[PDB]
Design a protein that fits this description.
Structural class: alpha+beta
Assembly: monomeric
Entry title: Human FGFR3 in complex with inhibitor F1
Bound molecules: ligand A1L5T, cobalt (II) ion
Radius of gyration: 20 Å
Number of domains: 2
CATH superfamily of the largest domain: Transferase(Phosphotransferase) domain 1
Name: Fibroblast growth factor receptor 3
Strand order of the largest sheet: 1-2-3-5-4
PDB class: transferase
Strand content: 15-25%
Number of helices: 8
Keywords: inhibitor, transferase
Helix content: 25-40%
């Protein structure tokens, strides 16, 4: 394991193809902090091919970092190395791993997370129906790609989708993602989680489909909190008895059918991401 408890240097293996030299990065304004790191805007030279600086997001350790946070940030970086380029994913761009603090460079999304983006645009240019379907389609396309790369996200939610300046949706926060014992799937927020993840301690692409269903509900409620009024301690009992969230007012019947299919108890009866892309493509085309 890499450890902060060294008196020489960093103990991270070199990976030249991802390394960016430090003079080619200028750190800028803070964007915020998460569980195991902070994010700052930066400009990076020659990492997307002309010496023009590109704005990126830099994830780094917090001032109150732990040794585990180092391990976690390295693991996140290593997962992202394994995920190829896709327009609807936040991709790794580079890293500064030698000769200084650990910096993980990822694509920048100027409008922040989808959940806050939606909530900020609640009626009281509005978000239209077409905008909502477009958001859902783009996330589905991202997830279809992830699944094809044999990657389970495990933490899909509106909070973990970012929005670019040009309103492109990019799936983010790969800290829990796995390349496909008793506490397996214990770090997954239960309101977004397929029941089988906890009851059977398995996780497949079809489990991610359940989460996508919850995300769809979040989109059409403009960032509503799932299962409002129901405590996490009561949730699985209600779900086992067949309760499902009600149709959002912004959702049409056809979209609500898609959403409810994603919450089939039986994973194999949920649609695949390839099927969801097809379904949402159809909706998006008719609405234009
Ligand atoms: N790739 C990114 N682009 C942005 C991100 S991460 C930002 C962010 C992510 C996680 C976190 F804990 C704190 C801040 C917010 C933002 O406006 N753009
Ligand atoms: Co069915």
């Amino acid at each position: 394991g890499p450890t902060l408890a060294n008196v020489s240097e960093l103990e991270l293996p070199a990976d030249p193809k991802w390394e960016l030299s430090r003079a080619r990065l200028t750190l800028g304004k803070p964007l915020g902090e998460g569980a195991f790191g902070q994010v700052v805007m930066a400009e990076a030279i020659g990492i997307d091919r002309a010496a023009k600086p590109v704005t990126v997001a830099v994830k780094m350790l917090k001032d109150d970092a732990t040794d585990k946070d180092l391990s976690d940030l390295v693991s996140e970086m290593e997962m992202m190395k394994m995920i190829g380029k896709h327009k609807n994913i936040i991709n790794l761009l580079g890293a500064c791993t030698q000769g200084g603090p650990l910096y993980v460079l990822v694509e920048y999304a100027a409008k922040g997370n989808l959940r806050e983006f939606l909530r900020a645009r609640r009626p009281p240019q509005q978000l239209t129906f077409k905008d909502l379907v477009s958001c859902a389609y783009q996330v589905a396309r991202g997830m279809e790609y992830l699944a094809s790369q044999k990657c389970i996200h495990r933490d899909l939610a509106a909070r973990n989708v970012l929005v670019t300046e040009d309103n492109v949706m990019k799936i983010a926060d790969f800290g829990l993602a796995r390349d496909v014992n008793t506490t397996t799937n214990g770090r997954l927020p239960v309101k977004w989680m397929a029941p089988e993840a906890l009851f059977d301690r398995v996780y497949t692409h079809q489990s991610d489909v359940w989460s996508f269903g919850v995300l769809l509900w979040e989109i059409f409620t403009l960032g509503g909190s799932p299962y409002p009024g129901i405590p996490v301690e009561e949730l699985f009992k209600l779900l086992k008895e067949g309760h499902r969230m009600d149709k959002p007012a912004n959702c049409t019947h056809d979209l609500y059918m898609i959403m409810r299919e994603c919450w089939h108890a039986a994973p194999s009866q949920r649609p695949t991401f390839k099927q969801l892309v097809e379904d949402l493509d159809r909706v998006l085309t008719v609405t234009s």
